[PDB]
Design a protein around this ligand. Structure first.
Ligand SMILES: NC(=O)c1cc([N+](=O)[O-])c(Cl)cc1NCc1cnc(Cl)nc1
Length: 294
């Protein structure tokens, strides 16, 4: 815009282009996201306007929402790096466990807050987790499907990452619950630990089958109602659950226990962010300083 001075393009966003910009007046540096149209949902803008109130230390602040012309501008507090880049940079050595624990703990605090205010993220992934030099990590770019939604891609040809999608979403459930976020965070937790994506599916069915191959094909015993789900097929292959210690070695039993609860198939059995915070895994949590190279 004109009130802002573009610094550089931070890339593509789940909905549009993103720029690092400076407010010519306040001099503050922000992330400016330009969103896609037939008049722009007057309901969406209200939804968005609601999130501006959602303030928490582990949630990227939505500073402003500006609807002008056929474009929508979202102004966010700026953070220099995302967890995906950080994980790639830590690939050879791995993120120290104390930092993994600190990040997981902060993300659960953020989720507990959002969920207590009936806000779902719905599209958690490493790239949507931002970090700073102070050791903080924050939840960004909430993709409320009931706030704007999502077409075939982001809005302009872009392979949607399904790696962190909960099974109920893949099985066609129409109503997402706070559980979908816990699932995604469990997938991220596993990835920070092993330094490899837990379920790197390349299609919706491959995503689902990779989950089944690891956690076992779900049945009525572990997930009541699963065989009645919209996209469930009795023809799904039946895979045996793999031993859990093979999945995120060499994570300790406290960690494996928490992860297993974050990855329960039944959304109703899946642990809540609030309850996960009380898990013994966090008895010795601290807040380390990451080695960030900006
Ligand atoms: N809130 C933000 O600061 C932020 C927002 C969006 N976004 O609105 O979608 C995106 Cl992509 C990245 C962000 N920052 C991380 C980052 C990464 N690489 C560089 Cl060079 N600068 C910042």
């Amino acid at each position: 815009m004109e009130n802002f001075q573009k610094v550089e393009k931070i890339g593509e966003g789940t909905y549009g282009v993103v720029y690092k910009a400076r407010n010519k007046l306040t001099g503050e540096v922000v992330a400016l996201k330009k969103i896609r149209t037939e008049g722009v949902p007057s309901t969406a803008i209200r939804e968005i306007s609601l999130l501006k109130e959602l303030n928490h230390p582990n949630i990227v602040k939505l500073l402003d929402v500006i609807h002008t012309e056929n474009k929508l501008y979202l102004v966010f507090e700026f953070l220099h790096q995302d967890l995906k880049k950080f994980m790639d940079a830590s690939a050879l050595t791995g993120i120290p466990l104390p930092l993994i624990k600190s990040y997981l703990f902060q993300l659960l605090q953020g989720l507990a807050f959002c969920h207590s205010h009936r806000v779902l993220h719905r599209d958690l992934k490493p790239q949507n987790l931002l970090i700073n030099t102070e050791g903080a990590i924050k939840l960004a770019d909430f993709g409320l499907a009931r706030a704007f939604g999502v077409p075939v891609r982001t809005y302009t040809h872009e392979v949607v990452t399904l790696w962190y999608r909960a099974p109920e979403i893949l099985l066609g459930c129409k109503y997402y619950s706070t559980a979908v976020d816990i699932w995604s965070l469990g997938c991220i937790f596993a990835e920070m630990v092993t330094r490899r994506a837990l379920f790197p599916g390349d299609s919706e069915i491959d995503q689902l089958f990779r989950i089944f191959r690891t956690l076992g094909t779900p049945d009525e015993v572990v997930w009541p109602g699963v065989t009645s789900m919209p996209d469930y097929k009795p023809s799904f292959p039946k895979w045996a659950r793999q031993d859990f210690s093979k999945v995120v070695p060499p994570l300790d039993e406290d960690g494996r226990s928490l992860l297993s609860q974050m990855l329960h198939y039944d959304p109703n059995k899946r642990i809540s962010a609030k309850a996960a915070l009380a898990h013994p895994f966090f008895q010795d949590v601290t807040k380390p300083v990451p080695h960030l190279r900006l």
